[PDB]
Amino acid sequence: SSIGLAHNVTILGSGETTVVLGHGYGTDQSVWKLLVPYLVDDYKVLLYDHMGAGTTNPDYFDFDRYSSLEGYSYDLIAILEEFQVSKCIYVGHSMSSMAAAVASIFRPDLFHKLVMISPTPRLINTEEYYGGFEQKVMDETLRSLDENFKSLSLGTAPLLLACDLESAAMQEYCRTLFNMRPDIACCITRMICGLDLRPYLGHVTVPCHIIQSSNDIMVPVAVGEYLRKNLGGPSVVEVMPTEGHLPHLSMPEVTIPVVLRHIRQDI
Ligand SMILES: [Mg+2]
Ligand SMILES: [Mg+2]
């Protein structure tokens, strides 16, 4: 399988229903290592690495394909078809779940529901939409980017994860963050910050479980309610007693039981 190897696909567990696990920026499928053992006896589990992750071949990273989020959506579709999966339960962190939302638009037959950890359709504020970052504030960061990539990559990590440099979560996050090729991570960073999925949320019809931290510098709690009001299908919002943008990594004791509930229960 050329597509399975390029994305380091792993298949665990068994069952009529498949849980697909998609990771966020700067991580890979190993971020799910504490959730997977609670799924394998009741579901088949599919794990894949998004293109551009440190565990994938840099040469495969097409800068135009992955300058728009649906480039990732098409990869997900190709993986699901290759491994004979339909009507899956997709669990995704951050733009991975947004890539699966758009994937569900193209191929509703591939998704039974979406469990979304810290999703946002747009980071930039406008006159009606508070994404958490003013245009001027975001612009004077992206110009920094490759000239000061190390400082931005690591310097924003403690605020993003909301945990210490000595913590295991920060250590594990930086382990995978530091393996990305800088020009790939700048391209992906520039796509996420420039993303505006708001015009298309009404065409997402698959049920969506929106899981949030009560304090996420990247996702204001109102962004979750915005998603819920603008998705075209059913949705539920759960704001966890967590902080940081990667609560499945930094606070698994709270987050994993929440994720399992939304995996097991339908809206
Ligand atoms: Mg071959
Ligand atoms: Mg992300």
Numbering used by the authors: 2 to 268
Quote the study's own text:
Strigolactones (SLs) and karrikins (KARs) are two classes of structurally related molecules that mediate signaling pathways to stimulate seed germination. SL and KAR have been reported to be recognized by the homologous proteins D14 (DWARF14)14–17 and HTL (HYPOSENSITIVE TO LIGHT; also known as KAI2, KARRIKIN INSENSITIVE2), respectively. To elucidate the structural basis of ligand specificity, we determined the crystal structures of ShHTL1, ShHTL4, ShHTL7, and ShD14 and compared their structures with those reported for ShHTL331 and ShHTL529. All the structures were highly similar to one another, consisting of a canonical α/β hydrolase domain and a helical cap.
Y150 was changed to F150 in a subgroup (ShHTL4, ShHTL5, and ShHTL7) of the divergent clade, thus losing the hydrogen bond between helices αD1 and αD3. Therefore, helices αD1 and αD2 of ShHTL4, ShHTL5, and ShHTL7 slid away from αD3, resulting in larger pockets with a reduced chance of causing steric hindrance with ligands. This finding is interesting because ShHTL4, ShHTL5, and ShHTL7 have been shown to be highly sensitive to various natural SLs (polyspecific receptors) in a previous study. In the divergent clade (ShHTL4, ShHTL5, and ShHTL7), ShHTL7 had the largest pocket. For example, ShHTL7, with the largest pocket, had the helix αD1 tilting the greatest extent away from the entrance of the pocket. Structural analyses revealed that although the cap domains of ShHTL7 could overlay well with those of ShHTL4 and ShHTL5, with a root-mean-square deviation (RMSD) of 0.9 Å, ShHTL7 had more non-bulky residues than ShHTL4 and ShHTL5, such as T142, L153, and T157. It is reasoned that ShHTL7 evolved to use smaller residues to enlarge its pocket while sustaining activity. To verify the importance of pocket size for ligand recognition of ShHTLs, a double mutation T190F/C194F and a triple mutation L124F/T190F/C194F of ShHTL7 were generated to introduce large side-chain amino acids to reduce the pocket size by partially mimicking ShHTL3. The inhibition constant Kirac-GR24 in the YLG competition assays was used to indicate the rac-GR24 binding affinity of ShHTL7. It is shown that the T190F/C194F mutation led to a twofold decrease, and the L124F/T190F/C194F mutation led to more than a 100-fold decrease in the rac-GR24 binding affinity. Our results showed that rac-GR24 triggered the interaction of ShHTL7 with ShMAX2, which was consistent with the results of a previous study.
